[PDB]
Design a protein around this ligand. Structure first.
Ligand SMILES: [Cu+2]
Ligand SMILES: [Cu+2]
Ligand SMILES: [Cu+2]
Ligand SMILES: [Cu+2]
Ligand SMILES: [Cu+2]
Ligand SMILES: [Cu+2]
Ligand code: NA
Ligand code: NA
Lengths: 439, 439
């Protein structure tokens, strides 16, 4: 096979992507060992779906799991009557998701389960894949001539040839695994053929963070979760929290081997210690550094010039409401709250008007990082921690460190009942989710 | 003094730069030794004159040399009745140059002798200085906040505490010296205080080339000889031929010491060998690498973003004539020709019309590099060697390797009699110069 493993791509044909996937326990080889994972399409990750604006997607999900499941079309601004977070597909049953890809859309999205209380074990076991909306911007020469790859960042732990079960501590912290994989492979080699790489990045982990750095190189951010930036942004490192996506250009500067690493990052995970008192929670501290892949540069690399511009960000109408959503924790209970409450699918927490813009102030009053996700309605991050964001782009997950306030500009798009929640999916399963109704 | 030596600056006051300079033999300390050089203003280099568009310059040059001399205001699009290449100031006499700085002008220029047949020994002995036209573009934050320095690249050879005399070989090749200096200093240290440096670069050597590279860093070209580029251009190295200028931004990437070097470059200089036949010319080959300065980066450097734009390049009228100027050599005679002829100050070689545009095709049919200079009328290099130039900017010297054709777009500005010549000044003194009359 190619030195660099990537999921198989399924492309729309004639404007239609019609596909049946099964969600099924699947024996496979993973990281040099045999294991049974839960997969879409018989692979880990699931197949990458590649579409264009105004394509029709018709995806029939067959549930071959022993428990109910469903799909969240993470990041897609479509109707919550399709991206339906309350729908349950029973074992053995099927459901067809059908939607049209919005016209003004580009980037890397993904699909995974969203059946409340069962997301974390289903996502941990292997149920996820990517969806790429390809754009007319892809034809500009500075992107067309780049070498493109998708990197699905997802970790795993195996016990007895199956995904390791969740412990109580895992429900508190979010589960991380010791196998830190790219596209389901352990530290693959990317032997670059071109001097400019375009890398679509997806954090499809339950809880692990990836503080990304490429040895000896900056990265050029060109898209956030839900769309292009207005122009490339040079960064020395890039933090992707669970559920976030980004696209970067890499301009290889000389021949050689360069490690792409997940550098040490402390997200606030907790352990327990007994030091002659009795059992007390103690910080785990920063993650151990991980090598994600080996990047081999071609001979005498001469990277393309960067694009001068990407996509202008829409001018949004003035907002009509300001919301405040406060995140708190009860760590020893593994319970997580928004404005003092746990999720209740019968309770509507926020009511807004379609086609207006709202300002959401989300405040992390906990000690862990929490990556806040809103379904259906992509947002513009104005500031986090009191610092203005350095670019304009559509996002749908925003990471909050302890104490920080994010200010979001939220245009409300499709009508219906949807949700917002922490994308440490264990925290969603344990209550950190609420209901938005748009009318 | 400051760790980084730079010439003293003289600034216009209230719109006027009124200065008397003397050209005089001057005992000084140079590169750790005492020598007598020929200087302007008692220093080597001469003082940097710093002015703004529409300033008046009133410079009285007092000749305290034992031979006649004059000034060429290299690169300034002013009248050749002021920048007069035929004027002789006798020993002991003075002359006042008075002109207004053009409104649409910016960059690094310089002044030096232009008395035909005596340029090479006068320039080699120390007679040169810089002139900076500061621009409203200097106030954009990406330049204003950079740390600015001038680097005058000029080599020297000393014999008996004076500049070394010219040999016959030196008249053939152009003289290079073993002391390869920056601002008259030997391998100075630049201890950067800011992470972005703006470096004005001047090759004021008789003949030496500087194939510039900064260890571990690209350079961002922002101006050529006579003005800004339209936007910054990333380059891995930058060749400055005699008489050229450039301005670059340096974006320091990490703490440490980085050498700015003149890398090996073969300009076609010739030696003589006797191997049992008899005496035959043999290539000298590439220059030995030289370290120009040590660049110390500050702690945790965070460079400014590059400017997105600099100055739009003027749209020029369609040209009305195409000229062909062919450069040839008689190396053993140390004679150099344009279209078969040596300079004659009584003979007009080209006659053009003010405010028209001409295409000049300059063809190097010799084996040495020749840097072709036109007084008074800055030009746009369209292509050299059949390769399009990668930027639009005003230039006034264009380097031609053996065999290469440069195509230049030449707007004719001020009326009068002026010259064009090789800026290996030994080759000008030995005939490689001709006369342009604009009416
Ligand atoms: Cu998601
Ligand atoms: Cu959380
Ligand atoms: Cu969700
Ligand atoms: Cu000159
Ligand atoms: Cu020459
Ligand atoms: Cu001249
Ligand atoms: Na299957
Ligand atoms: Na003097």
């Amino acid at each position: 096979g190619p030195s660099f493993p990537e999921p198989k791509v399924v492309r729309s044909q004639g404007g239609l992507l019609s596909l049946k996937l099964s969600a099924t326990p699947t024996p496979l080889a993973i990281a040099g060992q045999r294991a049974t994972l839960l997969t879409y399409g018989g692979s880990f990750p699931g197949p990458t779906l590649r579409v264009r604006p105004r394509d029709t997607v018709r995806l029939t999900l067959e549930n071959r799991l022993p428990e109910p499941t469903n799909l969240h079309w993470h990041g897609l601004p479509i109707s919550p009557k399709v991206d339906d977070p309350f729908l349950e597909i029973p074992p053995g049953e099927s459901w067809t998701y059908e939607f049209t890809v919005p016209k003004e859309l580009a980037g890397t999205f993904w699909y995974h389960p969203h059946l409340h209380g069962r997301v974390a074990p289903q996502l941990f076991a292997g149920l996820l894949g990517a969806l790429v909306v390809e754009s007319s911007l892809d034809a500009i020469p500075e992107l067309r001539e780049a070498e493109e790859h998708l990197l699905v960042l997802k970790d795993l732990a195996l016990q007895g040839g199956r995904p390791a079960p969740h412990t109580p501590m895992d429900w508190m912290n979010g589960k991380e695994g010791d196998l830190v994989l790219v596209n389901g492979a352990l530290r693959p080699t990317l032997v670059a053929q071109k001097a400019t790489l375009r890398l679509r990045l997806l954090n499809a982990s339950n809880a692990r963070y990836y503080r990304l750095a490429l040895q000896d190189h900056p990265l050029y951010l060109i898209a956030a979760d839900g769309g292009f930036l207005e122009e490339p942004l040079e960064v020395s490192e890039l933090l992707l929290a669970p559920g976030e996506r980004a696209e970067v250009l890499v301009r290889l500067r000389k021949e050689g081997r360069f490690l792409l690493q997940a550098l040490p990052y402390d997200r606030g995970a907790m352990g327990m210690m007994d030091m002659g008192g009795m059992a007390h929670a103690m910080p785990q501290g920063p993650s151990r550094p991980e090598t994600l892949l080996y990047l081999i540069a071609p001979k005498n690399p001469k990277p393309l010039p960067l694009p001068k511009a990407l996509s202008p960000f829409p001018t949004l109408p003035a907002p009509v409401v300001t919301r405040r959503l406060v995140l708190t924790e009860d760590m020893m209970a593994a319970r997580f709250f928004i404005n003092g409450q746990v999720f209740d699918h019968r309770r509507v927490d926020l009511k807004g008007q379609a086609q207006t813009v709202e300002v959401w102030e989300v405040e992390n009053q906990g000690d862990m990082d929490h990556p806040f996700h809103l379904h259906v309605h992509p947002f513009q991050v104005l500031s986090v921690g009191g610092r203005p964001f350095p670019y304009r782009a559509w996002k749908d997950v925003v990471n909050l460190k302890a104490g920080e306030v994010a200010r979001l500009l939220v245009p409300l798009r499709e009508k219906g009942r949807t949700v917002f929640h922490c994308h440490i999916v264990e925290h969603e399963d344990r209550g950190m989710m609420g209901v938005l109704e748009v009318g």
